[PDB]
Subunit: 235 residues, 6 copies
């Protein structure tokens, strides 16, 4: 059955870890685009300024949006994945989510996985925690999803995962916790943590390309910053 | 390059000839759906009453809409077609058309063909006229498209084909003329006329299934209605 | 717990039987209005022309709409009912229904009953059939709801009752069948049939005012039309 | 001060009398267009099918809409008039009217006159009745506006004239009654009746061009239809 | 006659003084909710992030919105109040205000009072100034409303109070000035100042619960912060 | 032929240089307003707070918007200009631009010039650079428009100028570079630079009123600030 894997830039995307995880799937598997949501309905353009680029001689415009593409995995046991690469919208989240659920429906998506990253309290000197959230009582058993204590502000990931369950489409979101003292956008170690966890859930071989090297580089890069509150945040 | 073939039920669809032509492509080539336009924006539901059907025990609802699917043709020289099967909307035609053009854009559609049928003044005792309309000066040469005298009310086919040219996406619509004295929805002869003409334009083998038989049946069926204004409309 | 009883003029309202049933509840129980849906979003005004009336000297305008009021029943065992009196909208039915469901939610409505009438094949010489429709498996048992064979075009009643179950709000619609040979808008006998059936479902004493007389009058009125296909439609 | 004169095709426009009155002003005074309302918001396009015309070689599309132009009258005592030429919209009348009132406001319009025609009970053998409607208590005195008994369905003219008074912009609509037995769209006699009455209200010389001849022609044309219920409708 | 009392969190709500005043009315009088405005139309959700809470085991979502409830006061001389508790919207203020005015209309609201707080130049060592704003010339006399010099940026309170007068619904807003050097959200003294002034206007006994104590506590709390520009801002 | 000159406050308007250039045209030529875009569709009102002013006694509200007026220039060789004075919208830029293009179309605008200012790296001790941007290959020759290297975030000016070319309406935007170390809103020198360049493009005498003096004042004003990185930014 087809699975939708989504990720959104901005507030639910602590090191761009989640957004680059899906980018990575789209790239490695050469994903074929078939839909972009109409930015006009969702995006404040002063907050999300569109950009101009030059193609041959000519000026062209890129809008913020959420784009849908299909990848064809994988083994002798083949499969379609529906990737959703978006910026978190600034308005009409209920419609936004309905729009994705319509695609999910037309495509017969059987499971929605959403990826995110937040800033947490774990050192770089140690592996990245990934935790799930689901309101599907079935999936809660069917994987080991530890639990959810969380009460507070939520984002489009939270909203989308809830829209799914109200729709009766099984969904789970995976969260990676990124060391808050080192939060700058290139974070290969946490991207990798997400991708590994997704693989166990979906049961799909993911090609990790240059990522395992990148993450090691990052760590033996950060380690050079020698002030050690990481000692404090380990005991 | 990918081609979009569209057709709309109602006023531009004289014997359901055009709408069944695309249905036929979708069926024969086992087309895979990936998007439906949001009916909420386009359809007056008293004019286009949605229906209820029973699936196993359970009630389910079908809305009027315009649905998009992909077919993979064909030879050792393969190709993707994007089929659009719609009801003509009752409102916001400019947005409707923009919505299809966005899909066309994301998918890299290089040519849009729209199919239609109108009631004309040709006998059943004779082959079905199919004529093109284009505002692409190139295509006008590149095929033989005889000409357009037409001035008058237009439909979503007309509008869509014009939205394309303003967008700089080459488009043509093919029209079949259906004998007005015999206009009842099963019209295999004209469906076939459209499909033949499309094949010459797109250069794609179309499997005609039971259609060539159906059309012959229809004619040797109508012929039994023996009042002969068809004699009058031949000289 | 609060119950919402809704009814819509037009296609689901064969003798205005259903719409006058709710009018009757609103009148007899002196229902207090608190909301009208914004007509601007739902109604084609050429199909539903608004009217002008004179209040004292002054011109005033009535729009088609769907209005919500509260009634306080009843015994030493009191209760609130939420009445919905609408015209069937011509557009955006999904939003329309969401709008009613939001009110239902804010008000803590525990059950939605929708009333309708259709033209059927029962004589005036015999009692009016009322049948239910529900997709709540619970209510299906909890009342005796015979069954649903129906597949075909549906209306806002059908849609609303389905929107409820998808929302997880128990809903049922009650249908009365009105003799098609006598379909003219004053139909007290069928209004009464609905009101009786509602009373059994909700367990609420409904004051029937002048209705029981009216219905008898109607029958001893129609009976004078003495051509007897009613004999044919009884055996 | 600038005056807005509006007229709408369809239900408030019995012989196209009102719509051609404004057309006549636009033509004779060579009115300069500056705005069309966005059809997309107001018009059902199956009811108001847009048309295609040929300009030089090229196909071009005309949408139903409501267009605004400025005329510069007149004497040594000059004046601007704002003409509104529309089709009655099928939806969002409240917004439609607000949109016109915004233009009225930006332009500093001090008075809105709306023209209409209905089918009445006066013979062709006699002059055309024109009656006003206003809810401005001032104008009611300031002209002789006989009175308004009318209660019933209204149109966009009625709505617009009421939107004005709620907005505190003085407005009046003038109605001509067109003999119902002769209702076919060319009606120069009633167009002329409107134009005459407008002239008295606005105090503006209107050039009547070929109209006074046309109306005489029409009458000495209808008179030839010699069945005389006009005798009946005079006593 | 029914009175609407509204208050909005954010920019017009200096110590949450105004928003807690209405909360207090809703709580003390056990107000019954009947409507929330559709957040989807008004709220940027990155600015107003919705929250997730746990109910029993289950995740549930709270959106920013403006909610309407009814309270039944009071004496042997009873009364209904309509409370409006909102966040100031970030968009479509004209529609927002129309939406509240529609409720006001359906409910027959005769007067709208809006509460607000701003940061002013009065010491904590002295009572809180409350001033009114009205464009109802009647109310201006009917209460003593000192005057309005104010010209500058306005908020939804300002807009709403103006929308009312244009609608011909009498409205006044009451403003409390909160010492700018002590602006942190718990401000019982100013909440109390609003409630007292409202009581004089509406002529309704308001139960002040723990507030009179709270305000005294606050003052004998702030007084401990002993730098005395309050001496400077008194002479 | 009529020319549209537009300018937008905010991000594309470095010293309010561009916005005051158009203000200056509107003032000097006594431009007559005929349309404002509906703020409701485009503006976040917390970011663009509307203001209240007093007219005689009475409170009145000004919304952020984009307003259109006509000026009649000029010589024995007369001309109409359409001025557009706006704030950059925060949402629906595609519609915003379509709305302006509709006016352009109704008015028969043949060329659109958009004015802007950015912060650049030129000293106050030297003339203000103005550079053009166009995607009209014709205009690129027809004026000397040096070239465009620019790739990056764009604004409504960029978007509008691109919407024009896609629409087949020739458009160019003129940019002035304002010394970043002196960016405070009164910048007469750069306003003047824009106006001069516009004059050469449009071939229209622009009355500069007090501006040439103002700019000199500004420079002999800034020069007094005597830290000299301007020496550094000249070599
Ligand atoms: Cl979450
Ligand atoms: Cl056509
Ligand atoms: Cl049904
Ligand atoms: Cl009327
Ligand atoms: Cl204010
Ligand atoms: Cl740019």
């Amino acid at each position: 059955d087809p699975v939708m894997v989504a990720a959104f830039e901005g507030w639910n995307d602590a090191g761009d870890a989640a957004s680059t995880a899906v980018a990575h799937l789209d790239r490695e598997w050469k994903g074929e685009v078939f839909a972009a949501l109409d930015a006009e309905d969702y995006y404040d353009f002063q907050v999300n300024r569109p950009t101009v680029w030059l193609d041959g001689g000519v000026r062209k415009i890129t809008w913020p949006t959420t784009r849908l593409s299909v990848v064809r995995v994988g083994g002798e046991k083949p499969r379609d994945l529906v990737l959703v690469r978006g910026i978190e919208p600034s308005m009409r989240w209920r419609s936004f989510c309905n729009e994705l659920l319509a695609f999910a429906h037309e495509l017969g998506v059987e499971l929605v996985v959403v990826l995110g990253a937040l800033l947490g309290d774990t050192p770089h000197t140690r592996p990245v925690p990934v935790s799930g959230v689901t309101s599907d009582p079935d999936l809660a058993r069917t994987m080991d999803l530890e639990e959810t204590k969380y009460e507070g502000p939520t984002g489009i990931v939270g909203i989308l995962q809830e829209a799914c369950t109200h729709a009766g489409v099984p969904a789970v979101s995976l969260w990676a916790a990124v060391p808050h003292y080192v939060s700058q956008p290139p974070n290969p170690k946490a991207t990798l943590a997400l991708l590994n966890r997704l693989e166990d859930l979906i049961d799909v071989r993911i090609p990790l390309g240059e990522l395992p090297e990148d993450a090691r580089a990052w760590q033996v890069g950060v380690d050079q910053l020698a002030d050690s509150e990481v000692a404090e945040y380990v005991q």
